[PDB]
Design a protein around this ligand. Structure first.
Ligand code: UQ7
Ligand code: HEM
Ligand code: HEM
Ligand code: HEM
Ligand code: UQ5
Ligand code: UQ5
Lengths: 57, 69, 387, 28, 64, 125, 244, 55, 53, 49, 53, 49
């Protein structure tokens, strides 16, 4: 891990930006994945899956 | 008031030791210790709760069957 | 040394008080995770204050608008359900953490000398917590809130001559109405800040002599700074508590409550089952154990009399239950009895729960009457157990 | 000559933080 | 057409024969009035409690 | 074919632990009786009885642990997932086998083998 | 007396919104809302629900607009100082069947049909309770008589409910083509009522899974961090003079 | 180097949690859904005499 | 201050769920912490079916 | 008086209007503004202490 | 955000009593701290005696 | 005590005794007297920013 250490951990200012980037990108990656599991576990039960949606007289 | 102590202490750097593998080291002996020292204490905590609860269900069941025609 | 120049900023007068009481304060190196519940209770207090301030920006303390303003928080304001559930279940997390905290001090005899004033300030804090949480539970103005506020204000009527005039002064009228609700909101804003001051004094008393330790022995020969050693240990508990809190918030936000408080308050009809929140049930059980109005209220006060008198009993010189087999056994019986009392308060008042409630109340008081006997008798242990 | 580099590296940290707390992708 | 729940409530009766026969015997034992306070509510509940526990985990499959 | 019961997951686990203890006590008695006595023990009676009772208790304990954990995990699978099959239960047999018999044998391959065998046995049923 | 006083306990039904990653069946919400506005709404209020609440859940924006225009909402006063009537808008709450609680009691034999906005949260085991109660009308046990104007329902505490049986077969006609049996409408109306009590459930559950997973990761790092700091103390060798 | 990499993973989450809790309190002060539900309508008017204004 | 539920208790009168008070048909306390019977207010009849409290 | 001071934020060019409406809790001074001012009026004196 | 007073100020238009903004007949500011003129909404004429906004 | 018992309302303005009207606007809108010096500094600059 020392090659990684030499680019990011040497200065705290970079290492702080590394933690902010990982907070951003890590949070987005979990958001997408949790939503994909929810879609796959609830097939057909969504609002866009109402067959007569838009056809109320 | 400060204490006056005489001792030799050797320490190793945190970055020279394994940090996590000690959690599952000699796991069976840890469980053995926890049950051996504490089985009297666990009995004095679990027996009254379970015993009193079991009697209350036993009471309510019989009382419910006496009032039934 | 002569402090001509400036060393570490932590030792400057700008930060010296913070440094010596939070960063460098000596702590016994053998503290276990049971010593992490004081900081957990401090965090729960902050969580209650922050969420409540923001909830108070949307709540209306009026009997005609109180119930709907809580529903408007849950339905209309963005993230309002989270503020509400973090506050309603936070009070539960506040009481779980503080109860574990109390029984830690009971197990290791942390109330004994020289820390009698620390226990006494804690008992006062418990009283402040109970009043604060109770009057807060009235604010939604549901069925449980109305009938809960009715009986506890009525508690003052147990006094013969001036009992009725205290009850009516508390209500602000002849019944629980808007006057009761509006004054309960004001007191519910003020009391948490008094809790903050009380916990700060509680902490200052603890720093006079330092914390007790699982061995119960003099610990000055092995002490380490609070930071980072017990900061990172507390940080393990803070994250563990967050997982525990989040399970309740997101997946079971209503199990620690009764559905009766989702019905708007109706002064004409009592619900068939009327109970406080779960953290008050052991007091509830002791109250109903006495078939007398004054007897029940006197027993409730005697619960806090016995807690206050506990650090002043003439005891043996050994603190920790790890070296006190008889006291250790009695502690676990008290813990089981306290769990039993909470379950009894959750039951209707009929057979066999009256007999079980009366025995459970007696055994609870037997813990405090027998403990001074134990230390008095065990004073002679060293002279009898010889090498 | 490092104070200018520490300033530039802490400005990048400040800019990344600002884009992170407020996420104005719809406004850019 | 026909109620799924009602059909299932008749088809789960073999699983609840014991509470049924105890309810049936209570009905006989109270056919005489005795000033109209005898009842069979308790045996009634036991039968339908058993029936409901049988119908519940199969009714929602027949429903869309 | 199965409509004679009253169930109760906690009751099921308790009764299973109790039956496991009974069967383990019987098995421990049989094993103690099959064995000969150590030669230093042929002329004195009491240590043989102590060893027999110890074997009875240890086998009762291990069998109770298996007979409890098996059904406990079986229900805790079929309660959360709430599907009734032979799959629910293959997991309970596996976890009982692995945990108890690997704690006893002190071996991980033995734990895996025991869990696998219990899984197949509970699968056939 | 003894057992009737609390009533008969309801079973545990497998609701499609049960489970840590389970959402509402939105088709069953829309179906259950038609049951409400055709059977329930004549006597029960839902004062916490607006017409905009259904947009993005069961109905489109236009559908919910045409729905609200179908009803007559009081408003005013005009510049002349009188109260007038106007078509409903999306911001308008679902309309009340009665003018006040005393009017409700007068129309229902002195009993008040409770507001159904939070009823699944306002009863123990509420979703299963509402389903079992609606589908649980039957004949009383032997020796139990019911006062005229009341109906027997073992799930109701006391066994005598002022509600009549309202979920007769084909009491509604569905827009998608689902056989509207008693059990089907009972399922759909509870899906609607459960969503009405907790409209935040789907967002709540997506938040819970996301953060409990993340906080679990931080707990592993918290443990490693604590163990890294303390390792210099826990592995130290201490030499002392004392023996006993 | 391995330690600092392991610690940064948990530091991602603490920052994420801190951001989330702060933004929850901030946005709870924003306009509620009922408030946003009354921000569009049309009203019609008539005529008035010269040299005067009507609010 | 709670309201005793009617047709409940051990005496055919009223039972208060809060702390277990049992009132007889005449409203007198028979069992439970309550020390006094239910209060009788002033009232009178008018002809046969108009009761003034 | 509240309508003016809560509008002092609009002098900010980019986010000035956004701060005013977040301060107001809507599009005008209304109940959301009065309810939030009351809560802050209870809390600020304890900070002042 | 204050409301200007009609028939007031030194331009025959509107005068803001709060910080002294002056508007003219066309709702344009001529002196004061207000940066902009009075906003014009979307109005039309359905007939001689009918407005709509 | 002199302010409380004999001049309880001279330090304020009578306009606060009229319930708030979002339509009409008081011709003399001023703060409390202790904010006046700041309010006069704000008014003197003929620019909002
Ligand atoms: C004619 O017209 C005028 C008037 O009319 C008659 C006047 O009366 C005045 C006099 C008025 C003043 C001198 C007061 C103006 C000055 C200030 C500072 C305003 C006072 C400030 C406010 C009203 C703003 C209130 C602040 C907030 C709502 C901030 C909200 C934020 C909070 C509470 C916390 C933020 C949250 C987070 C960071 C998230 C995490 C928080 C946690 C606690 C964890 C003038 C000049 C005037 O010309
Ligand atoms: C809001 C409530 C409370 C807060 C914030 C709080 C805070 C703390 C803290 C930070 C400590 C030192 C660290 C620790 O031991 O965890 C402590 C210690 C202690 N607390 Fe409290 N506490 C609270 C309630 C109570 C109560 C209700 C009691 C007793 C009735 C109590 C009795 C004690 C005692 C005896 C100690 C010393 C323990 C020892 O040294 O072993 N506290 N408290
Ligand atoms: C100064 C800080 C606090 C403020 C401003 C505050 C304010 C409020 C408000 C406005 C409510 C009503 C909204 C709701 O029902 O959720 C409420 C409810 C409540 N508060 Fe607090 N609170 C504070 C601190 C606390 C503390 C410290 C406790 C615990 C001891 C507490 C316990 C409760 C409880 C139990 C409820 C009822 C929750 C429910 O059933 O909905 N609050 N509080
Ligand atoms: C499918 C349509 C309906 C549903 C889902 C529904 C739902 C409910 C619910 C959940 C309760 C609460 C019972 C309790 O408190 O435990 C209730 C009670 C009641 N409902 Fe409805 N209701 C419906 C239609 C009606 C209609 C059409 C009427 C009148 C014609 C009515 C009159 C009543 C009355 C009088 C009660 C109270 C009865 C009592 O407390 O004794 N309901 N209903
Ligand atoms: C069915 O029955 C019951 C409930 O119901 C559901 C309950 O919930 C509880 C729960 C209550 C408990 C455990 C006790 C609460 C204790 C206290 C001391 C609260 C009393 C305080 C009040 C009401 C406010 C304090 C007011 C003050 C100080 C006045 C302010 C005046 C000035 C500052 C001058 C119990 C026991 C109960 O049996
Ligand atoms: C060796 O020493 C130490 C301990 O061992 C005894 C500890 O247990 C802890 C951890 C626990 C603490 C500090 C509990 C204190 C909590 C209290 C008083 C209640 C909640 C705290 C609040 C509201 C903060 C009050 C303090 C101040 C300065 C007010 C301003 C703060 C804010 C507005 C956030 C710490 C940090 C510590 O160092």
């Amino acid at each position: 891990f020392e090659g990684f250490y030499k680019l990011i951990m040497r200065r705290n200012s970079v290492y702080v930006t590394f933690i902010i980037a990982g907070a951003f990108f890590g949070e987005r990656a979990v958001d997408y994945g949790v939503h994909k599991l929810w879609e796959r576990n609830n097939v057909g039960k969504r609002y866009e899956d109402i067959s007569v949606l838009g056809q109320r007289p | 008031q400060p204490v006056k102590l005489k001792a030799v202490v050797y320490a190793l750097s945190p970055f020279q030791q394994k940090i996590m593998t000690g959690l599952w080291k000699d796991l069976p002996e840890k469980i053995h210790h926890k049950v051996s020292e504490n089985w009297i204490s666990a009995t004095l905590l679990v027996t009254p709760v379970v015993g009193t609860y079991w009697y209350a269900q036993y009471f309510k069941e019989q009382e419910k069957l006496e009032h039934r025609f | 040394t002569i402090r001509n120049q400036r060393f570490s900023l932590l030792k400057q007068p700008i930060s010296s008080t913070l440094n010596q009481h939070l960063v460098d304060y000596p702590t016994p190196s053998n503290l276990s995770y049971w010593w992490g519940f004081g900081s957990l209770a401090g965090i729960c207090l902050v969580i209650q204050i922050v969420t409540g301030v923001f909830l108070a920006m949307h709540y209306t303390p009026h009997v005609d608008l109180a119930f709907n303003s809580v529903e408007h928080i849950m339905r209309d304001v963005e993230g309002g359900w989270l503020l509400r559930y973090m506050h309603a279940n936070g009070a539960s997390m506040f009481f779980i953490v503080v109860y574990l905290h109390i029984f830690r001090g009971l197990y290791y005899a942390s109330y004994s000398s020289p820390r009698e004033f620390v226990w006494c300030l804690g008992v006062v804090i418990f009283l402040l917590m109970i009043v604060t949480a109770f009057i807060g539970y009235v604010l939604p103005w549901g069925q449980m809130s109305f009938w809960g506020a009715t009986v506890i204000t009525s508690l003052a009527s147990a006094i013969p001559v001036v009992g009725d005039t205290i009850v009516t002064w508390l209500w602000g009228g002849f019944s629980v109405d808007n006057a009761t609700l509006n004054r309960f909101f004001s007191l519910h804003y003020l009391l948490p800040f008094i809790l903050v001051g009380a916990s700060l004094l509680h902490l200052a008393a603890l720093h006079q002599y330092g914390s007790n330790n699982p061995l119960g022995v003099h610990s000055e020969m092995d002490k380490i700074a609070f930071y980072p050693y017990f900061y990172v240990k507390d940080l393990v508990g803070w994250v563990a508590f967050a997982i525990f809190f989040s399970i309740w918030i997101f997946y079971a936000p209503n199990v620690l409550g009764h559905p009766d408080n989702y019905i708007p308050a109706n002064p004409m009809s009592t619900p068939p089952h009327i109970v406080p929140e779960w953290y008050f049930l052991p007091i509830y059980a002791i109250l109903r154990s006495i078939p007398d109005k004054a007897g029940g209220v006197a027993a409730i006060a005697l619960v806090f009399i016995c807690l206050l008198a506990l650090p002043f009993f003439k005891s043996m010189y050994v603190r920790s239950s790890s070296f006190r087999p008889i006291y250790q056994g009695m502690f676990w019986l008290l813990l089981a009895d306290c769990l039993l009392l909470g379950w009894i308060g959750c039951q209707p008042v009929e057979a066999p729960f009256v007999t079980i409630g009366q025995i459970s109340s007696l055994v609870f008081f037997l813990f405090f009457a027998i403990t001074p006997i134990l230390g008095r008798v065990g004073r002679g242990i060293p002279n009898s157990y010889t090498d | 000559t490092i104070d200018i580099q520490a300033a530039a590296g802490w400005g990048i940290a400040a800019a990344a933080g600002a884009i992170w707390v407020v996420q104005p992708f719809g406004w850019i | 057409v026909v109620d799924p729940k009602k059909y299932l409530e008749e088809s789960c009766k073999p699983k609840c024969v014991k509470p049924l026969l105890e309810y049936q015997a209570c009905v006989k034992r109270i056919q005489g009035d005795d000033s109209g306070h005898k009842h069979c509510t308790g045996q009634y509940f036991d039968y339908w409690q058993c029936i409901d526990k049988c119908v519940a985990p199969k009714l929602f499959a027949k429903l869309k | 074919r199965y409509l004679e019961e009253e169930d109760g997951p906690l009751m099921k686990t308790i009764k299973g632990s109790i039956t496991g203890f009974g069967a383990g006590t019987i098995y421990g008695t049989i094993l103690a009786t099959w064995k000969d006595v150590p030669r230093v023990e042929r002329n004195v009676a009491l240590p043989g009885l102590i060893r027999t009772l110890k074997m009875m208790g240890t086998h009762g304990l291990t069998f109770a642990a298996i007979g409890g954990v098996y059904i406990g995990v079986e229900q805790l699978v079929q309660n959360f997932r709430s599907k009734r099959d032979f799959y629910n239960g293959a997991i309970g047999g596996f976890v009982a086998g692995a945990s108890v018999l690997g704690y006893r044998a002190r071996s991980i391959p033995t734990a895996i083998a025991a869990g696998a065998t219990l899984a197949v046995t509970s699968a056939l049923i | 007396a003894d057992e009737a006083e609390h009533g008969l306990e309801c079973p545990n039904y497998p609701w499609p919104h049960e489970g840590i990653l389970s959402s509402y069946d939105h088709a069953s919400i829309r179906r259950g809302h038609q049951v409400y506005q055709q059977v329930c709404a004549s006597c029960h209020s839902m004062s916490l629900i607006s017409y905009r609440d259904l947009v993005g859940v069961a109905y489109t924006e236009e559908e919910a607009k045409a729905m609200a225009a179908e009803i007559e909402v009081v408003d005013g006063p005009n510049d002349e100082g009188e109260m007038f009537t106007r078509p409903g808008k999306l911001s308008d709450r679902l309309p009340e069947p009665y003018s006040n609680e005393s009017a409700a009691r007068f129309a229902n034999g002195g009993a008040y049909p409770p507001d159904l906005s939070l009823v699944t949260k306002a009863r123990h085991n509420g979703q299963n309770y509402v389903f079992a109660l609606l589908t649980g009308y039957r004949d009383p046990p032997a020796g139990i008589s019911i006062r005229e104007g009341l109906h027997y329902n073992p799930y109701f505490p006391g066994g005598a409910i002022a509600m009549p049986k309202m979920l007769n077969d084909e009491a509604v006609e569905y827009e998608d083509g689902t056989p509207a049996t008693e059990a089907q409408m009972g399922k759909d109306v509870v899906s609607f009522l459960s969503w009405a009590a907790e409209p935040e459930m789907e967002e709540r559950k997506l938040m819970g899974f996301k953060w409990i997973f993340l906080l679990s990761l931080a707990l592993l790092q918290a443990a490693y961090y604590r163990r890294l700091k303390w390792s210099v103390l826990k592995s130290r060798k201490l030499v002392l003079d004392v023996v006993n | 180097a391995f330690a600092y990499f392991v610690l940064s993973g948990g530091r991602f989450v603490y920052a994420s949690v801190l951001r989330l809790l702060v933004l929850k309190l901030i946005v709870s002060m924003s306009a509620s859904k009922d408030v946003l539900a009354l921000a569009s309508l049309e009203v019609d008017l008539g005529s008035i005499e010269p040299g005067t204004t009507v609010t | 201050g709670c309201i005793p539920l009617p047709n409940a208790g051990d005496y055919g009168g009223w039972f208060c769920p809060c702390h277990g008070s049992h009132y007889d048909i005449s409203g007198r306390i028979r069992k439970g912490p309550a020390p006094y019977n239910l209060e009788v207010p002033t009232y009178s009849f008018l002809e046969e079916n108009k009761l003034l409290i």
